Design an enzyme around this catalytic site. Structure first.
Site, mmCIF file in Angstrom:
data_model
loop_
_atom_site.group_PDB
_atom_site.id
_atom_site.type_symbol
_atom_site.label_atom_id
_atom_site.label_comp_id
_atom_site.label_asym_id
_atom_site.label_seq_id
_atom_site.Cartn_x
_atom_site.Cartn_y
_atom_site.Cartn_z
ATOM 1 N N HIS A 26 0.927 -1.121 0.000
ATOM 2 C CA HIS A 26 0.000 0.000 0.000
ATOM 3 C C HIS A 26 0.972 1.175 0.000
ATOM 4 O O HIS A 26 1.977 1.145 0.735
ATOM 5 C CB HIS A 26 -0.872 0.067 1.276
ATOM 6 C CG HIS A 26 -1.758 -1.127 1.459
ATOM 7 N ND1 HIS A 26 -3.084 -1.187 1.068
ATOM 8 C CD2 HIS A 26 -1.458 -2.357 1.941
ATOM 9 C CE1 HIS A 26 -3.529 -2.434 1.312
ATOM 10 N NE2 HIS A 26 -2.578 -3.180 1.847
ATOM 11 N N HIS A 37 2.535 -6.105 3.006
ATOM 12 C CA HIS A 37 1.730 -7.087 3.720
ATOM 13 C C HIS A 37 2.035 -8.470 3.154
ATOM 14 O O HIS A 37 1.831 -8.694 1.946
ATOM 15 C CB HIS A 37 0.225 -6.792 3.554
ATOM 16 C CG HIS A 37 -0.226 -5.576 4.316
ATOM 17 N ND1 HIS A 37 -1.416 -4.947 4.042
ATOM 18 C CD2 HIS A 37 0.402 -4.921 5.325
ATOM 19 C CE1 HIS A 37 -1.486 -3.928 4.871
ATOM 20 N NE2 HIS A 37 -0.410 -3.866 5.670
ATOM 21 N N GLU A 51 -0.752 1.949 6.057
ATOM 22 C CA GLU A 51 -2.085 1.754 6.599
ATOM 23 C C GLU A 51 -1.977 1.918 8.105
ATOM 24 O O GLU A 51 -2.630 2.784 8.686
ATOM 25 C CB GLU A 51 -2.580 0.378 6.190
ATOM 26 C CG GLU A 51 -2.720 0.341 4.675
ATOM 27 C CD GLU A 51 -3.824 -0.577 4.233
ATOM 28 O OE1 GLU A 51 -3.721 -1.792 4.483
ATOM 29 O OE2 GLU A 51 -4.808 -0.091 3.641
ATOM 30 N N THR A 62 -9.171 -4.178 3.280
ATOM 31 C CA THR A 62 -9.899 -3.925 2.032
ATOM 32 C C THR A 62 -11.143 -4.806 2.058
ATOM 33 O O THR A 62 -11.183 -5.815 2.773
ATOM 34 C CB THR A 62 -9.093 -4.377 0.799
ATOM 35 O OG1 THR A 62 -8.605 -5.707 1.043
ATOM 36 C CG2 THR A 62 -7.946 -3.415 0.510
#
Ligand SMILES: O[B-]1(O)OCc2ccc(NC(=S)NCc3ccccc3)cc21
Ligand SMILES: [Zn+2]
EC number: 4.2.1.1
Length: 256
Positions: A93, A116, A103, A196
């Site tokens: 991200h 991630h 995040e 998400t």
């Protein structure tokens, strides 16, 4: 559908995925002074020696590097985990600027990006069944800051031109994810969710304290990707991060 735009971004997700306002949503701000050191937390065991990467794909939200998870090749165990978790894919991200992109945040600090590494609990048989369980996934989160280049990330950066748009994929074999880890495996851990849609609350989050350093050139190439598919108006894939959510009735534990 959902995205990160001004008309379909995180603030809109709850309409199709009500769990967006759940009791254990992610990401969260990690308040370093409020996190509780837990001496009972075992050291993490990252075994990526036999990892088998297969391909890299632009899914319109991020790019995922996928692994063969039909056997216990690359696994995560130890730490707060009970059981063996198989690595299925990793993605990042990132932001439109170096001042944002992660995040999770640390004392409100936002990093330029966040990696991630997604793993699922083998006791549940497959990934689809695992996401339906409170301890179905274990995601290893690693912050990225802009500074020196990350050698082990360059193979990823260089293939991005081949998957510029949504739906594109490319072969990505023999990639060693160990080249993406920081020196220290000290971590914070807490129960949370996918960041998400469908935002399922099936994740044990393990966020490393030590960020990895990447160069301005490497992160800049991430920002050249597209949310849109080929033949559609170009939308730069940037700021594909969900902001910090309420910690609510949870405590973040530290391994250090
Ligand atoms: O929020 B994240 O970007 O961060 C961590 C993370 C881990 C896994 C995913 N989802 C995957 S592998 N599939 C989508 C899906 C998941 C569950 C049901 C249907 C479909 C996304 C994220
Ligand atoms: Zn993610």
């Amino acid at each position: 559908h959902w995205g990160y735009g001004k008309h379909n971004g995180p603030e809109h997700w709850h309409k199709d995925f009500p769990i967006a306002k759940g009791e254990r949503q992610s990401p969260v701000d990690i308040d370093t002074h409020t996190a509780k050191y837990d001496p009972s937390l075992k050291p993490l065991s990252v075994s990526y020696d036999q990892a088998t990467s297969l391909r890299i794909l632009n899914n319109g939200h991020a790019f995922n590097v996928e692994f063969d998870d039909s056997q216990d090749k690359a696994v995560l165990k130890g730490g707060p985990l009970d059981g063996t978790y198989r690595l299925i894919q990793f993605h990042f991200h990132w932001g439109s600027l170096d001042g944002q992109g992660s995040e999770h945040t640390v004392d409100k600090k936002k990093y330029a990006a966040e990696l991630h590494l997604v793993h699922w609990n083998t006791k549940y048989g497959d990934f689809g069944k695992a996401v339906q369980q409170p301890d179905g996934l274990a995601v290893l989160g690693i912050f990225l800051k802009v500074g020196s280049a990350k050698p082990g990330l360059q193979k990823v950066v260089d293939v991005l031109d081949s998957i510029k748009t949504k739906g594109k994929s490319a072969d990505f074999t023999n990639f060693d994810p160990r080249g993406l880890l920081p020196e220290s495996l000290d971590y914070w851990t807490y129960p949370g969710s996918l960041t998400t849609p469908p935002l399922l609350e099936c994740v044990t989050w393990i966020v490393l304290k030590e960020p990895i350093s990447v160069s301005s050139e490497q992160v800049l190439k991430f920002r050249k990707l597209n949310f849109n598919g080929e033949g559609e108006p170009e939308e730069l894939m940037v700021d594909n991060w969900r902001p910090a959510q309420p910690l609510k009735n949870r405590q973040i534990k530290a391994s250090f």
